[PDB]
Amino acid sequence: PITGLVYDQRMMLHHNMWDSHHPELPQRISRIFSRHEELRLLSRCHRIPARLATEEELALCHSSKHISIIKSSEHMKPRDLNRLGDEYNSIFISNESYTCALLAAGSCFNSAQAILTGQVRNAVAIVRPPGHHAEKDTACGFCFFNTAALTARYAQSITRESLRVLIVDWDVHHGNGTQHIFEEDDSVLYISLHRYEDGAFFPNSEDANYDKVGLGKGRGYNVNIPWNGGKMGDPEYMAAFHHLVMPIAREFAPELVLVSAGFDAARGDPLGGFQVTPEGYAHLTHQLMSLAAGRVLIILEGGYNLTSISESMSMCTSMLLGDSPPSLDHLTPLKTSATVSINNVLRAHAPFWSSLR
Ligand SMILES: CC(C)C[C@H](NC(=O)OCc1ccccc1)C(=O)N[C@@H](C)C(=O)NCc1ccc(C(=O)NO)cc1
Ligand SMILES: [K+]
Ligand SMILES: [K+]
Ligand SMILES: [Zn+2]
After folding, report:
1. 1-357 adopts what CATH topology?
2. 10: Cα within 13 Å, side-chain hemisphere
3. Is the alpha carbon torsion for 281, 283, 286, 288 positive or negative?
4. Which ligand does the CA of 165 lie closest to?
5. Ligand 2: distance of its center to the CA of 19 in Å?
6. Where does the record locate the signal sequence feature (predicted)?
7. Which residue among 15, 90, 172 is best mutated to probe the pocket of ligand 1, counting the most ligand atoms within 8 A of its Cβ?
8. Domain residue spans in the chain?
9. Measured distance CA(338)–CA(215) in Å, rounded
């Protein structure tokens, strides 16, 4: 019955010095925030302050070497920023990038704290740079530190090590970093829906396929739902939630839900190629609100059509605030390949979840 919101325009200062039209724009977060004002959603939320993550907090998921290298970019000359960024897959770095990544993480820590202390029921974090491609030891795909992964560990650090955290990653890309950070971990259930195209879609790794179910005691706690072929939209995402995400999540019984909420599967996204609607994102949000006593934190990842992400994320906040959820068509037939994907995931995870048996 209270929704928190965190936004700090300081996270706009991370910018691409070599191509100012790179799609991971400063204006992503300001546009999303402005839309919350236009729709009169902001005043309905409890405003949560951003803060820097500490280096000790980054160490919850990242190696000291990786922390130190990204920190070293704070005062680099342009030539060295360009050279360092080129050492990673799909990274640009400015002198503000490290601090902006710290603010993204710390904003979500404060949001998770507000939820778990009972100050708010749920929250939204309008943050950048994104996080889910960041690995323990490297930056990747516009991401420096894995905000969502860190937030899960932060949450466990103020409650208990075994706090059950569900991370739902509906960004159109696989969150390779989140999967790897938690791959051997049965306390954090990672579920990702993502365009895959048999490895043709970024991050171009078979790690994103449906047969990567986790490792050791984490077998069953990594659920990859990869899309191939068709332009997927609300029917396919709703079906994946009905057949896979929600049955597994209910059986896991999370105590906190983090959404790696990229909006690049949205209709109109320049690089996702998918057609999830703002109503579709609202439907998925409302579904997730049935878990964890409503304790849901929505964390912006990707999403690159400024109007599309602003409308889609605002509709999620409207859902968190309790507004009436949309009625959508669960009977629209799926793209053929989507049924194939769902059946492949079901077969892979039925050994681990009785709700699939
Ligand atoms: C119309 C364009 C916006 C297309 C887009 N191009 C693109 O990302 O530009 C990157 C760029 C690098 C250097 C200078 C300028 C720009 C793309 O999808 N390129 C393909 C090759 C790709 O996969 N690029 C890498 C990539 C990594 C992470 C995410 C994400 O959002 N993850 O959550 C998206 C894309
Ligand atoms: K994803
Ligand atoms: K896991
Ligand atoms: Zn993405």
Report:
1. Arginase; Chain A (3.40.800)
2. 17
3. negative
4. 3
5. 26
6. none
7. 90
8. 1-357
9. 26
